Design a protein around this nucleic acid. Structure first.
Ligand SMILES: C[C@H]1COc2c(N3CCN(C)CC3)c(F)cc3c(=O)c(C(=O)O)cn1c23
Ligand SMILES: C[C@H]1COc2c(N3CCN(C)CC3)c(F)cc3c(=O)c(C(=O)O)cn1c23
Ligand SMILES: [Mg+2]
Ligand SMILES: [Mg+2]
Ligand SMILES: [Mg+2]
Ligand SMILES: [Mg+2]
Lengths: 487, 245, 487, 247
DNA sequence: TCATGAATGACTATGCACGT
DNA sequence: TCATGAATGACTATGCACGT
């Protein structure tokens, strides 16, 4: 039996837990804004072909595929994570298209795994765009059977768009969601002014990203907290729901709440008011009725007494309920395997850097592949010019190895190219078919030149990110939901 | 008039209208279906009571054991009426009791168990036409450009498909026609537009003609005598298709 | 609103439930001895490639694939069904190779889905043998997306081998498991004496199938109950565990139970003895100790008092515990969509009928494919004999269609054959490859001759079932476990 | 000294041993119902008892005592150990002289270890001082040779070593089934657990030692206490050098 | 003291037929 | 009353950091 000191054991074990939780569980990667479970689910769904161009697959298949190949954890909590990515009141830009009962903003829980179907959303398809062109590093999974992506291409700024909240060890993150169009403008500026320093970049980006854009709409009151978050990485953003005063035929007034601030449970909110009126804390309120439905959305009617002022009751609600509540912004994300609190210019810049990396790597992959095709095509063309000899050679060969070895000597060709000649179908010996090989060589050589040009000019690389992102935003960008007002 | 919860089952999602004459109770198979039903309902007049698991057979089970069953207590309590001799239709909290189960066979089974509970403990609810059966959709036709259509049978599916194609509409051969295998697979909107919206829902009102004949059939099908049930099935299953010809 | 009478509703609904449970849930198909869930799990695993030639897949993937494509029900109960098929104390011949904690014969439950892996067993691979050669009817799944098998090839008599227990409506089944080697002998006899009437067949089969063979070993006392089951389809078979009396130096004598009858929970058994001693209904017992382990198997030591006779205590155990318990056999299975209580001769015969159907269908499929292969090969040989012309013709063609049309004219060829010549690689123009095409034609024509012969001769068809099954039994057959003794 | 074991006033989850001598008895505190299940099956029921723990244990450093004593898992541990806590601690009533903590090799197993060690150090410190607390080291790999008996490895290094040696020795492995990798105790069956963590003739145990009590008291409070800042700065300070603690 | 969300599943109740 | 075996998932408690 080996002896071990409790201090060594405690220190080693807790640090190991803390660090893996920090880097590999609770906190988002800055480049794609994803935690490991998110990334693994999406890639599992992607690899399984559970895409918008095909019908929803049973959600159990996504969970199981995630479990069996990438995420060595439980089916229950993996389903919870998948469910979250499909809720329009959770994600500003859902990555999962859910079919069935995925719960509600209140206490109505989602249906069990068996009842629901799921597939990737069009925007999630942009997260994974060209992932198979060596645009991101892959590593072996938890048992080395297969490869998984370390990060996604993320062809739209997902971290800032969908935000992220996570409790780690020694630290936590709470990044709010943002409007895609505003983020794009920030990216576009960052691309144009690629030499601008941090001071200028922050000023530019803050002008374009007006503030968080929550899926639950509502209101943002003030601008200091927003400014604090973008300059410090910490800030308190005051949120409000929307209230509309209605008058009755009798002359009674009632308050109608149709929107609530981000991450406020509808049922807890109603219950809180109900409990704050029975104990005597929100006088002036006469009756509380939830007139909500799937057709009118949120609609909480608060009838107030005749001897009650609407704004007084509304102010009391702001004070004593989450009708007004603060979002504690803490811009924490993993950067190069290290947790870091980031300014808004840093978040944009780091994302832009990731996009350029993706575009260069994609170009590199396409360039390598283009050269391989061209190389083989050149071999085929050599065969066509001496086709009479090539065929006679293969026929007169006792084996295919003899025929191959002969072809190398005959036409001064590689073994790979010679192999291609051997694998050639009689189909391609037709007149027009011989011609396509020629034209294809010409076609590819033009493509190779284009690709080489892109790698040589950082300007084009930035242009591609701009144009491709612009296309994404034009297609999937939406209006702002959260209205920003002054004090 | 009657008070709604805002002393009743915890599972109950009560309505807002205090008038039983205007109120409806949807007794739903499964928490999933019940969950989405609670969302898609008209909270003014429609209440939801989700039932979990197969209901206890009151024909077989001893009386005391039935009263210990949480699901039965929920139904009796939510309906407000007593049972057997202590039955008082005046205290009926909903004048419309809709049973909503899956189109599958287990939904049919649960229907027989609920109808058995009602017929034995609260018969006047059936006699006075307070019991209804919601007919769920089986298919959802998802046209490329047009509004989606729901079908409640294989025949209606074929018909609506035929009509739409003739009319120049088109469907994906991938997404295509979604087939419902249960209420749990539907969302709030779908349930409203097919089983809960009073202007389009397909309800069947349970009528009771011959009480003595009903009493006999209930005892055969639901009773403890297997042999009687076995022979009845072998005798009448052969001709189950032709009951309405 | 439409009116409906309660009698109409009750009768229709309950009959529909009863019939589906009877035919499509609780009771086994006679041909493969499987219920729908069993068949669907195994085929799901098979189609997914979760086979003995690859490592165990996470069991969730099997559940999800079964759930998502074939079995429209819950993940929980499907996992329960998969697990049971992997327990050596449940199935006489397990169909699932489980990796991990799959529970115990006692109250130790199986690990949750997340912890376990699973794949098909070699014998299950015989259930599915050549299922892709049109050996069984397929039908569309629950949503018409894919096809599923109505029954499995079942190249060993699985119903009798693994038995079946199920509670339906108006009826239930309880078929015990049997020793594979004994079943094969019965099948072999049924094949040889294919014209024998029922009376002779029953006598022959009853001589070879000596009785049930339970995975839990134990004892069968008497022969009447076994005879009743095989002759009537109903019978009460008395089972016993194994008891070994041990004496201790000076100490008292103790009963050591090392085996229990089929489907007796080890923990319930111990608890039953313990509770019947506390109250005092099994005097003579001094102490109960469970000395069981993973290394010695079941070992329940019952120390008895000194003024107690061992045989008296053992009989008391037989009487008042499940140390002796009866298996209520009810040989009920679905035959052609109808529930039927069957004699042992009927069970064998129906299985043999299924095997012959499989072999004929396999032969038909192989003959059709052989003819297609030969047909194309004939085209290739024609091309080789006129190889010089074939190439020249293709060259002068503006398209491949002109080249094709010419080949038909040149060599008197089908459109399929000409296309095959067109798809031919230059690879096969080498000497040995040209010869390989010739010999391949010769081989197939020989195979076609063999296949045609099989279809024309019922003798060979029966011979194939015999030889193939014999091969399976030689490989996967095992010793009898349950010992049969007289009164 | 001898005490009665449960057989048809102790935790329901407890699978007690048969031996009434604590000196010869052992309590395996196991992470998860699955692992505990297989342990209950693979153990030697004579001397080895199993107490499965479900979910992350409550941090007694952060939570007030009254809340800790209401936690079912803590109650199970205290009750099964038989000893009291704090001032009412009586080692004489210790029901097992070997308390083996057996958690997954993953990071959450490490976390549960720190939580259990925190419970022990704060409520029942003498168990650590007198060497009654041990840590079981689970296997990480199972090498499945085609013809030879399978070998278990407790590290990546040992895997590579046993792999090299076997191949050098002329043994062979499938590249499909091959080397099974354990991701937790729950993935193991009864036999595997016995032959790697419970069989006293082959199991790899580490005995928890307590040298500097004052230093331990400080480290426990920093890592497990309510002070986040202290914990944050400690991790950032010392995580960089966690690899080199034993160099 | 409550919410967050990614980590660490056993228990609870019925239908159904049949034999104790 | 209990076991069998496929059918019809919510609830329960901790870690972890932070703000009302
Ligand atoms: C039908 C759902 C919901 O209800 C269920 C149960 N309840 C029934 C009545 N309740 C008052 C308390 C218990 C239950 F004990 C078990 C299961 C179950 O095992 C299960 C499954 O798929 O395996 C699915 N369900 C179950
Ligand atoms: C770790 C396992 C077993 O223990 C668990 C719970 N116990 C906590 C303390 N016990 C006193 C009783 C309940 C629990 F309440 C929830 C879960 C859970 O949600 C879960 C999952 O995969 O999502 C997995 N587990 C849970
Ligand atoms: Mg959970
Ligand atoms: Mg259903
Ligand atoms: Mg279950
Ligand atoms: Mg683990």
């Amino acid at each position: 039996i080996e002896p071990v000191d409790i201090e060594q054991e405690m220190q080693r074990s807790y640090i190991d837990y803390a660090m893996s939780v920090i880097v590999g569980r609770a906190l988002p990667e800055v480049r794609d804004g994803l935690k490991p479970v998110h990334r693994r689910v999406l890639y599992a769904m992607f690899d399984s072909g559970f895409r918008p161009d095909r019908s929803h697959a049973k959600s159990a298949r996504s969970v199981a595929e995630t479990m069996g190949n990438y995420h060595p954890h439980g089916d229950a909590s993996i389903y919870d994570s998948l469910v979250r990515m499909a809720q329009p009141w959770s994600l500003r830009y859902p990555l999962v298209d859910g079919q069935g009962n995925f719960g509600s903003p209140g206490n109505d829980p989602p249906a069990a795994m068996r009842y629901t179907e799921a597939r990737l959303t069009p925007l999630a398809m942009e997260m994974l765009r060209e992932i198979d062109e060596e645009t991101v590093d892959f590593i072996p999974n938890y048992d080395g059977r297969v490869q998984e992506p370390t990060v996604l291409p993320s062809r739209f700024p997902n971290l800032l768009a969908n935000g992220s909240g996570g409790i780690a060890v020694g630290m936590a993150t709470n990044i709010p969601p943002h409007n895609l169009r505003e983020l794009a403008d920030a990216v576009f500026w960052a691309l144009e002014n690629h030499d601008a320093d941090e001071e200028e970049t922050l000023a530019a980006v803050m002008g374009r990203v007006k503030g968080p854009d929550f899926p639950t709409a509502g209101l943002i009151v003030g601008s200091q907290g927003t400014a604090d978050a973008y300059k410090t990485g910490r800030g308190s953003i005051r949120m409000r729901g929307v209230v509309e005063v209605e008058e009755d035929s009798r002359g009674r007034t009632s308050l109608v709440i149709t929107e609530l601030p981000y991450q406020v449970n509808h049922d807890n909110f109603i219950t809180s008011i109900a409990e704050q009126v029975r104990d005597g804390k929100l006088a002036g309120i006469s009756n509380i009725e939830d007139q909500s439905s799937d057709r009118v959305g949120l609609r909480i009617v608060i009838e107030i007494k005749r001897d009650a002022v609407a704004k007084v009751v509304i102010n009391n609600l702001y004070k004593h309920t989450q009708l007004q509540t603060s979002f504690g912004a803490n811009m924490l994300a993993i950067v190069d395997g290290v947790p870091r609190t980031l300014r808004l210019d840093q978040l944009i810049r780091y994302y832009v850097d990731h996009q350029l990396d993706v575009i260069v790597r994609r170009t590199t992959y396409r360039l390598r592949k283009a050269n391989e095709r061209a190389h083989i095509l050149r071999g085929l063309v050599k065969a066509l010019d001496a086709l009479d000899e090539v065929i006679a050679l293969i026929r007169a060969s006792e084996t295919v190895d003899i025929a191959r070895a002969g072809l190398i000597e005959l036409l001064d060709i590689d073994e790979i190219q010679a192999q291609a000649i051997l694998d050639m179908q009689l189909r391609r010996l037709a007149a027009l078919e011989r011609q396509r090989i020629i034209d294809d060589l010409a076609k590819i050589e033009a493509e190779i030149a284009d690709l080489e040009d892109i790698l040589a000019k950082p300007e084009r690389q930035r242009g591609i990110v701009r144009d491709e992102l612009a296309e994404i935003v034009d297609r999937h960008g939406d209006d702002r939901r959260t209205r920003i007002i002054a004090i | 008039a009657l008070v709604r919860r805002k002393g009743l089952p915890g599972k109950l999602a009560d309505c807002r209208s205090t008038d039983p004459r205007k109120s409806e109770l949807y007794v739903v198979e499964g928490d999933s279906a019940g969950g989405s039903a609670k969302s898609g309902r008209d909270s003014m007049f429609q209440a939801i009571l989700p039932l979990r698991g197969k209901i206890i057979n009151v024909e077989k089970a001893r009386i005391d054991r039935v009263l210990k069953n949480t699901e039965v207590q929920a139904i009796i309590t939510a309906l407000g009426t007593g049972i057997h001799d202590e039955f008082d239709i005046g205290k009926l909290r909903y004048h419309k009791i809709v049973l909503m189960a899956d189109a599958d066979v287990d939904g049919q089974h649960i229907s027989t168990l609920l109808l058995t509970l009602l017929f034995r403990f609260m018969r006047p609810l059936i006699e006075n036409g307070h019991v209804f059966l919601a007919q769920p959709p089986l298919y959802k036709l998802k046209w490329q450009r047009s509004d989606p259509e729901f079908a409640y049978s294989d025949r209606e599916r074929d018909g609506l498909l035929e009509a739409g194609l003739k009319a120049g509409k088109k469907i994906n051969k991938e997404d295509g026609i979604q087939r419902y295998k249960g209420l749990g697979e539907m969302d709030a909107k779908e349930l409203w537009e097919t089983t809960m919206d009073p202007s389009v829902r397909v309800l069947r009102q349970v009528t009771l003609d011959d009480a003595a004949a009903a009493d006999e059939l209930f005892s055969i099908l639901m009773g403890e005598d297997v042999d009687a049930r076995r022979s009845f099935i072998t005798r009448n299953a052969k001709d189950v298709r032709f009951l309405d010809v």
